[PDB]
Amino acid sequence: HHMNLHQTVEHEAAAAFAAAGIAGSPVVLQPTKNAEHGDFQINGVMGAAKKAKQNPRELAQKVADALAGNAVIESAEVAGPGFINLRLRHEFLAQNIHAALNDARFGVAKQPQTVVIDYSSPNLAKEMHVGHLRSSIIGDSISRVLEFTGNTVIRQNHVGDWGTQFGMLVAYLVEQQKDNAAFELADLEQFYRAAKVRFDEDPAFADTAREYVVKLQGGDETVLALWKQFVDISLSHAQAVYDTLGLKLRPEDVAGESKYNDDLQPVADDLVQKGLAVEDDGAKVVFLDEFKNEPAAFIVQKQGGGFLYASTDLACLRYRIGRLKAGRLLYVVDHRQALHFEQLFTTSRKAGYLPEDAKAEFIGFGTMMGKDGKPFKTRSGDTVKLVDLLTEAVERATALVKEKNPELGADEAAKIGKTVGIGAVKYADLSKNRTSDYVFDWDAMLSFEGNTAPYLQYAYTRVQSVFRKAGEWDATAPTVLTEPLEKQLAAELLKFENVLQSVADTAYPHYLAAYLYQAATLFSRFYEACPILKAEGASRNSRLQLAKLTGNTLKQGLDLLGIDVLDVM
């Protein structure tokens, strides 16, 4: 009870191949670029013709002939040397639109892999930065799509909660609490800088900080409780941003780097025992011929015993495979760490930590930039505060929403403004290929036309306005499709499952954003060309069915991007 449109069409094409004497040859079915050519294109004829050295044009026409009268495909036309353009039959479209609305068991079908997805994952010594913002948003949408397609999704927020820098942070916290028992740590950036001033200016403070590191590494209960105080504060700052954004990431999903500290020396010793890590001036180093320039050096323990980012991620991968029983690992991380994860994966495969049938994927994203192409900063050049950025998005959207509808009350406008403003923060990121650098732009992201969250949100509200106007209708009535844009919109709506499965496979949410924008703009063309309220009979009811499924698909698709809709704006 679903529609995998690609598979349904491929099945008919495969039968036509068999009827044409090329049974078992790959169909190589692809969607069409322009719907003026049809809905799908068969690309496999040239390859199939190679075996018998057959004439490919004649073979393509034989396949097309075998599709005459097909229930799914109403026309099959040869193009180029031996491509075949397929147009879906309107009765097939109508029946499956009807089913998507009325079959109570209809859904997006689901191979329940266990997927551990690592995202957001801020360093706790400072505030969350705009790179962590990208990871939070991109990872949250991927995680939503994976759940919706039936995977077992384990979110892990790999917070940076351990390291020598916490020595000066703990020492500075102690000083600040001695001078005020009501001490509030408002800004982690200012706190961090102030502690470094003390560490750089005061040798007695630096000695004190180094002693706290000793006690932290030693597990001193008293110093660990001070560490936990700081970590809990920093986590609360992150959680307030998560709450504002409306993520699916929860406190129970936190799994900080400190979790793996007892595994670091076992991993290092294991790699030495397997001959993968070797001694290099007292350090333990993994040399990888795979990353030669001379093989790349992947240091797993320093000369004096200290561990590294690489050490923690090796231990953590072992845990995610061996204890969480993950079949697929996704790391949603700034693109500048690509080499770290490539070396992590290669080392883990050689060590047996990552089995041959497990997948591990670096889900990289580009740098957030200002309009000058330089990394994103405030007008005065300072680090962007995420809480300020999100407040600004909501304030900006609230002003625009009041401009568009001056009859909104202040409280109604503010509620709409939150949905539009946060929605735009997410969509302006997610609608771009994650791997590109991203220029932040208030004017672009808050435009009510073009490819933006407000455009799609207001598109949903316009669908709801149609139903406020239409009166009684019957979603269960037989569906008829007679006009070109009726049929084009139906075919687009039936692609939803395939789009979502593509995002699950590739971890590119911008494919879903692109689909929703195409669907909304096509709905608008349909609405102009095929009057709904002026229609009568089956035409009226079928156009209302199309509008209802459009609304449902916009709402569901936006939800999987983390974006909400409103019945009224």
| x/- track of binding to ligand ARG for residues 223-242 (CB under 6 A) | --------------------
**Cα 490 to Cα 518: distance, rounded to the nearest angstrom:** 13
State which residue, 207 or 232, has the beta carbon closest to ligand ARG. 232
Q: To the nearest whole angstrom, how small is the minimum distance from the Cβ of residue 229 to ligand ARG?
A: 20
- Residue 123 in contact with ligand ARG, rule: CB under 6 A: yes
Task: List the one residue out of 249, 295, 153 whose CA is nearest residue 287.
Answer: 295
Segment contacting ligand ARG (CB under 6 A): 63-71, 115-123, 197-205, 208-216?
115-123
In this structure, are residues 147 and 117 in contact, taking their beta carbons and an 8 Å threshold? no
Residue 172 neighbours by CB under 8 Å, 6+ apart: 191, 194, 195, 198
| x/- track of binding to ligand ARG for residues 158-187 (CB under 6 A) | x-x---------------------------
State which residue, 163 or 421, has the beta carbon closest to ligand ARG. 163
State which residue, 353 or 427, has the beta carbon closest to ligand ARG. 353
**Cα 278 to Cα 284: distance, rounded to the nearest angstrom:** 5
| Site size toward ligand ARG, by CB under 6 A | 10
In 305-384, where does DSSP find H-type helix?
309-322, 338-351
- Residue 331 in contact with ligand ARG, rule: CB under 6 A: yes
Q: To the nearest whole angstrom, how small is the minimum distance from the Cβ of residue 119 to ligand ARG?
A: 8
Hey, what are 109's tokens?
A: 């079908």
Q: To the nearest whole angstrom, how small is the minimum distance from the Cβ of residue 236 to ligand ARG?
A: 17
Q: To the nearest whole angstrom, how small is the minimum distance from the Cβ of residue 257 to ligand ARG?
A: 8
State which residue, 191 or 331, has the beta carbon closest to ligand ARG. 331
Q: Are strands 40-42 and 83-88 parallel, antiparallel or unpaired?
A: antiparallel
Segment contacting ligand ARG (CB under 6 A): 121-129, 243-251, 410-418, 433-441?
121-129
- Residue 362 in contact with ligand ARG, rule: CB under 6 A: no
Segment contacting ligand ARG (CB under 6 A): 118-126, 201-209, 293-301, 520-528?
118-126
- Residue 121 in contact with ligand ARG, rule: CB under 6 A: yes
State which residue, 316 or 456, has the beta carbon closest to ligand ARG. 316
- Residue 39 in contact with ligand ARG, rule: CB under 6 A: no
| Alpha carbon distances (Å) from 65 to 44, 71, 77, 444, 525 | 16, 14, 9, 49, 33
**Cα 257 to Cα 309: distance, rounded to the nearest angstrom:** 9
Q: What is the DSSP string of 284-302?
A: EEEEEGGG---PEEEEEE-
In this structure, are residues 211 and 222 in contact, taking their beta carbons and an 8 Å threshold? no
| Alpha carbon distances (Å) from 200 to 66, 166, 193, 207, 343 | 81, 15, 10, 11, 35
State which residue, 122 or 417, has the beta carbon closest to ligand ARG. 122
Question: Could you say which of 140, 253, 313, 429 contacts ligand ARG (CB under 6 A)?
Answer: 313
Q: To the nearest whole angstrom, how small is the minimum distance from the Cβ of residue 429 to ligand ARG?
A: 17
Hey, what are 310's tokens?
A: 């690489």
Question: 485-488 long-range contacts, Cβ below 8 Å, gap at least 24?
Answer: 485/522, 485/525, 485/526, 485/529, 485/530, 486/526, 486/530, 486/542, 486/543, 486/546, 487/88, 487/90, 487/93, 488/35, 488/522, 488/526
State which residue, 237 or 396, has the beta carbon closest to ligand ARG. 237
Q: Are strands 40-42 and 29-31 parallel, antiparallel or unpaired?
A: antiparallel
Residue 8 neighbours by CB under 8 Å, 6+ apart: 72
State which residue, 267 or 333, has the beta carbon closest to ligand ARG. 333
- Residue 256 in contact with ligand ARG, rule: CB under 6 A: no
Q: What is the DSSP string of 9-75?
A: HHHHHHHHHHHTT-TTS---EEE-SSTTS-SEEE--HHHHHTTTT--HHHHHHHHHHHTTT-SSEEE
Q: To the nearest whole angstrom, how small is the minimum distance from the Cβ of residue 401 to ligand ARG?
A: 35
State which residue, 168 or 330, has the beta carbon closest to ligand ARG. 330
- Residue 383 in contact with ligand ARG, rule: CB under 6 A: no
Segment contacting ligand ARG (CB under 6 A): 119-127, 198-206, 492-500, 556-564?
119-127
- Residue 333 in contact with ligand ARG, rule: CB under 6 A: yes
State which residue, 310 or 522, has the beta carbon closest to ligand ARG. 310
Q: To the nearest whole angstrom, how small is the minimum distance from the Cβ of residue 147 to ligand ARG?
A: 20
**Cα 34 to Cα 28: distance, rounded to the nearest angstrom:** 18
Q: To the nearest whole angstrom, how small is the minimum distance from the Cβ of residue 338 to ligand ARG?
A: 12
The residues binding ligand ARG (CB under 6 A) are: 118, 121-123, 158, 160, 313, 316, 331, 333
